[PDB]
Point group: D2
Chain length 329, copies 4
């Protein structure tokens, strides 16, 4: 009659149910699942949201993971296909289906992509008025813009996902030759997320000492610092002898990391380059922006890119825009 | 002219500064400092608040700790003596000066205490309209009520602090004889926080098996299960051959733990016993209440206390109220 | 000539490279990948080992995950197919290929399994002399024995994996009806890991109060407490409308949790039931054993199983052994 | 007869009790207590050791803290006054009594210090053959040497404590003016730990861009970058209007952080400067050394200190040695 009830009574007060911190995920699967595994075990949102047009998977996904539900502590995990559930989320991220096939054409992914991605737009924005969007979906930089202009949430609240991992692998491969690790070995590569991403090796140092200096100069010869980068670009390629990426999931987790908590750190991502170098026509690509509480702490960090590198960044924008131009909106 | 500025520019967006998760502390020192050390390194509040009538200490306190500021990550730590700073906090806790002197009279602490504590009231409540109050201050149970009725925030949002540690030490001393630890060894002692706290050994078990059962019956003879408890009460006493308590700080941290995050777990604390056992006259003491987001998830858990124990709890209320009656409001 | 070198010199001391805490994984994939994601982001082993006969995947696996390598901190992650790399690990776990196909016959998995699993044996044991083995592989209970007797490491160091999650989902589904969660809601189900797993509801309680008591009696009628369990068994089934399990990975992580650290907590697993209830013939199944540093802290916890339940456990052993008997060693 | 026993039986195996990861603390109190609070709640050692000639305090200390024992998870905490308990520890740290009195003479602390510190030596070394020593005790740099030469453990295993916090406060105060925080704002100050500590502002940058550059040049005028540093030195001073330091405890925690785990990161500390700049006579002071598993990963990082700064470091060594010379061994 009141079993659960008689063991657990209430008080005369009654501050009704509610919540506070929200997390929403689009695309229950690899990128998603990986993200979920990362953000869900790390601990962030009061309640998390998963939503797809794959009834089946989600059940199994939301349910089983929920299983562990108990190995850590979150509260609630929701699923569905009507972007009704979330209504009011801070940390929102999307992916979608369209992954590289060994062979290239990551850019091709532009045509076949807007199809589904577009519609996602009206849904995710309407209910997440106070939400910030992170896109793990292909074409970190590119797709970002579409939704943004599409939705038109003031920049700072919109984040693509782009060049986050770029660095890490770069920073990481880096420590191997050093005998120190990704940690202190701070190495930077900034662009947009695909073979060609300019590298700013001029920012190579350890501790309080600048690297180039220690060695002197660079790539055009040397021992192929050149290579380091390329297979950062190439990185994508081989791996999928495994089929895809199933856990760069940390990067995305880190990215929103700053956001949700609101700490103001300097990290890659994709914003708007309109009055900077050559690029002058909204070229949402990979660039330092600083993030925080429901916004990208409105600060894009300016640095002096060596010309070699300098143009490289401008370059990207140039090559990048080609694809949008077509529009197919 | 714009040094910091030229390195760090902004965007055309501009979601002005603000924040989200708040923590406020009263009494920069042991209990406080310990709490701070606990809550601040554990990671919870976006920004933390410290406030006392000890200008000096606080500087050194807020400043130095702030020092580490960098060994973990919070954002901002504020100090002052005008309860203006916090304006709008969720997790608020108070202590105050008045600690036991080897010899007893923890209750004496009632007269000399309301003096300062009272005034604290108007201040902390006026600005923390949406805040919940945890009292590490002496007389967990007792003092609680004063402010509450004083302020009159609907129960669920007001928490004393009382019998939290009671259990742990009890649960803890417990594992020593077992060869398992506080973890799984779930042992309960519930009352109000001072020598006399009734113990409900009937709730002694491990895994899925009830203890008493395994041994059979109990204290009146045995090997002094009796003792276990008493020096749980006594616990206070000796230690101060060290002067006081400088780190039960976890208990308080745990207590609010449920709160801030809002998870709904079952833990001791001090509420209102008005229509339960004998006690019928607002006897805010040590009892299970379940806590959550800006409220004590309005549920006090009912259990069948053996008569021996049964009365013991009623008892406490009886002996406890003596002190208030006098009022001196 | 000495670039990396001139930036980083050494001292006259020289305590050569080495390490300390080791983790080894068999089966780079779901269970594995999930485990890895769990144990690797949680933080445990100084260095981790992955090893399969799937050159490709592992590259992509070890490499990419390694990618994040930098989002947390471990040190080294190794891969190969010669069980040479690990030589000397504490926390070793295996899975293998052979997952349920919607339809049942998890037991069928016995024939098709020993084929590959057997050989794994000589390899993993020869080099991990001081290692403990956890089997996420199908037939938690069953397979366990094979290797064990096979290897013959003294019990306490051998753990199957079996009924870990059993509980959690049970404990978990549990909190839904309560309004409290897996946390405090301690609910037990112990057996071996497949439809039929006996449940000991007699161990149903919250706080310090026993449940059955609160409601009184049980299943044979009621509101189907019966069901709760079955789809704990069924749990497996549906989900794979997703294909399999991709993240119960926590359970395994938790399981070794106690181990690696060596804390002595009470948890399910699979050991040897030889002189307990009816079972008398080495029936390695799901049962409480307590785990710790390179051993299962040699303690299996005895409790009084209601007859209804009582036999149920005995039962399992009976039905379980059928499969081994055949031997096919 | 076997109460605890009958609930918890053992197995025929029996891998006797033991342990693995060890932590030892000298000076139960502020620095110590703070450390303990940090290292003990953070989670590191299997078992921790506290040891003093203050029977009383320790009881209360070890006991009460132990209290929380249950709010996190370690295993065992030991106390005594015979350096017998630890026998075999990795992470060992000492402090001792002799703190600054508002007025200066931190160096005076040399005479009054060796008295007690000396004897500590034979004890702590004899039993911690495989232990590394961190000195939170005054004169980070100075005292370090005494014990070292005293004990003579090969450098890499001996760490003073010196300039750790130096940076943080420096790095930290830093972010205030920036609008980013200690995190990314990597700012370096390296010397020995007392007013005069040279600063290498030439290593001022954010992201991948060097600072000085952005502003151009420096201190001799400017807006007092000079000041920033000095009250880094001064930092010590005022605070003690609070009596001392009660929680820089993180720095020490971080310092050993690298050690215990063995990760190889670049951090301040005190080593031996014998064949570097001017200093040529064992001047154990504040300098980057890289730390790891039971050793300071034998690497001291070389960088080009501007002359202004250049000499400053040499300088320190010069002024520093004065005090030892006297010897009073
Ligand atoms: N942007 C980046 O920095 C970055 C980094 C990693 C991966 N990725 C992107 O993420 C992808 C992940 O590939 P994968 O192999 O792991 O999985 P997958 O592409 O096969 O699965 C895609 C999933 O996206 C979600 N999705 C797709 N269509 C959707 C729709 N209309 N509505 C809502 N959700 C929908 C669903 O969860 C779906 O199962 C890559 O191929 C790439 O597009 C991007
Ligand atoms: N309630 C409980 O469960 C529980 C458990 C532990 C300790 N305690 C209480 O906490 C005390 C801590 O003692 P201690 O030795 O650690 O330190 P302490 O009593 O000497 O310092 C008390 C501090 O309380 C704060 N305080 C005092 N007067 C105040 C005022 N008017 N406004 C604002 N803040 C004020 C200040 O930070 C002050 O320095 C105990 O004596 C007891 O009262 C209670
Ligand atoms: N024991 C339990 O409690 C429990 C719980 C969850 C899942 N599981 C088991 O784990 C399986 C995971 O299935 P999945 O779909 O996630 O992945 P999967 O079965 O398709 O991949 C199996 C993987 O096991 C490893 N493996 C297989 N053969 C091996 C060999 N000869 N040497 C070394 N490693 C080898 C490889 O990493 C391989 O890719 C389930 O089907 C079941 O067998 C068991
Ligand atoms: N080296 C550094 O980087 C650094 C940074 C912070 C503080 N400190 C040092 O730490 C001190 C801490 O001062 P405090 O006010 O916090 O506390 P305190 O000086 O009053 O207490 C000192 C404690 O050191 C231990 N100790 C002293 N004599 C000892 C002996 N013979 N054997 C074993 N242990 C003994 C005891 O725990 C004792 O209570 C400072 O004054 C300074 O010496 C150094």
């Amino acid at each position: 009659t009141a079993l659960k009830d008689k063991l657990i009574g209430h008080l005369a007060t009654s501050q009704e149910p509610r919540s506070y911190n929200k997390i929403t995920v689009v695309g229950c699967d690899a990128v998603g699942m990986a993200d979920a595994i990362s953000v869900l075990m790390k601990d962030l949102a009061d309640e998390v949201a998963l939503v797809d047009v794959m009834e089946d998977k989600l059940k199994g996904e939301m349910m089983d993971l929920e299983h562990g539900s108990l190995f850590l502590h979150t509260a609630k995990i929701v699923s569905g296909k009507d972007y009704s559930v979330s209504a009011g989320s801070k940390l929102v991220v999307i992916t979608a289906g369209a992954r590289q096939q060994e062979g290239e054409s990551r850019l091709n992914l532009v045509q076949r992509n807007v199809n589904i991605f577009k519609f996602i737009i009206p849904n995710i924005v309407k209910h997440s008025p106070d939400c910030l969007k992170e896109l793990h979906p292909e074409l970190g930089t590119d797709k970002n813009k579409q939704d943004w202009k599409l939705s038109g949430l003031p920049m700072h609240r919109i984040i693509g996902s782009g060049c986050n991992l770029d660095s890490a692998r770069f920073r990481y491969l880096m420590g191997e030759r050093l005998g120190v690790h990704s940690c202190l070995v701070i190495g930077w590569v900034i662009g947009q997320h695909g073979d060609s991403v300019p590298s700013v090796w001029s920012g190579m140092w350890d501790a309080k000492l600048h690297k180039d200096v220690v060695d002197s100069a660079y790539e055009v010869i040397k021992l192929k610092g050149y290579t380091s980068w390329a297979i950062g670009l190439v990185v994508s390629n081989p791996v999928d002898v495994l089929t895809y990426v199933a856990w760069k999931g940390c990067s995305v987790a880190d990215l929103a990391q700053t956001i949700m908590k609101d700490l103001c750190r300097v990290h890659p991502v994709s914003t708007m380059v309109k009055d900077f170098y050559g690029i002058k026509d909204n070229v949402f690509l990979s660039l330092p922006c600083v993030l925080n509480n429901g916004i990208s702490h409105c600060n894009i960090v300016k640095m002096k890119l060596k010309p070699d590198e300098e143009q490289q960044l401008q370059k990207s924008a140039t090559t990048l825009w080609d694809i949008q131009k077509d529009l197919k909106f």
